[PDB]
Amino acid sequence: LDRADILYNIRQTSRPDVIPTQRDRPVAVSVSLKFINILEVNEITNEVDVVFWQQTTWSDRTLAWNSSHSPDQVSVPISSLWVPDLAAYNAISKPEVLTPQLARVVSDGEVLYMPSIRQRFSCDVSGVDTESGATCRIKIGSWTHHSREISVDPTTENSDDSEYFSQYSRFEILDVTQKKNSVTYSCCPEAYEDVEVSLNFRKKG
Amino acid sequence: LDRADILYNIRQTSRPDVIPTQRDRPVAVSVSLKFINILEVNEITNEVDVVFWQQTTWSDRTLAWNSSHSPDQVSVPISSLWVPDLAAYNAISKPEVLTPQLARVVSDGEVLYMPSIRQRFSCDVSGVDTESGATCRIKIGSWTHHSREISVDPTSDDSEYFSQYSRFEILDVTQKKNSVTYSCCPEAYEDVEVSLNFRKKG
């Protein structure tokens, strides 16, 4: 198979509006934020503007192909694929995607989608000018799929740090921590899984 | 062949969502920025806003036709073509495309796409009012393709397209290519680094 055949086969068989569950088992989605910049901290209104790469991975076995005499991966536009309906529960602006809207699909059906995103959050920005700094918490999970349809997990790799973060920002990253949760609301009798990402940062100097 | 036939043939055979590789060779993409303006240097949050023409060329020999008693080129909307997924790795705003989203296709299969783009970057702007000025570095590469699928090469300095009405002036523009291989993975990752050295006018 060439890339044209691979893509053709993806178009046949991929349903962008149908969650790829296999036996009523949830679709396991992993999410990791790589922070690139912190752009406007508003001390007065507790608002922050962040740029981050949102590394999101999951499996969709409908996409799989036989990788003998064939490419092991392809880039496919996200409008041809199902993508998890992740949202930052505490965002106060629409996520602005800065990068080409393509995902990388592997022959086994593993999908990686990593948009660079600019987005505004309401978070506690008192302490940003101190040594311990401030913490912005970003809570990400599925907007419409509860825990039997989508599970969300952090990645195993807090083995990095600020290599990704712009040397030119007024701010520096002290630490990033990831906690997984599942919360139940008064609206909805089942639980929604989220990752809470904590961005500990401070003004330089 | 008339332009209708040319475009028809492009629609048959061009797949906007399939990289036009050809015998597992990468698609060789060349990229050059021509700076038109520098709009807001923000001393408070180290940011600059630039306008530039992003001259991008590559080949897709599937598109080629016989140019005897025929047009040698056509303008085709980019939604009919595969375009490389280039990004400024260090951009902090979505690229705003100012110009019609059309590319030129030549009879040999060469494609030229040159949007005028406005975009924001993080850069150290403290020395912009000095004689040596400041430098904005823009790192461009494929967002999802490694070097065996898409290769990227630069094609320096000129002020030819720069607005004489900008508060700023261009001292220099340099373009280097970077190619890295990591121990995990046998493929190389390529980017073009563009350095824009500029200062406030006297």
Binding site: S32, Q55, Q73 | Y89, G141, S142
Partner: peptide, 14 residues
């Protein structure tokens, strides 16, 4: 890989 370059992160997840 895991790290650093966007395209490398795509092709070798982490």
């Amino acid at each position: 890989c895991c790290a650093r370059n966007p395209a490398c992160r795509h092709n070798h997840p982490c």
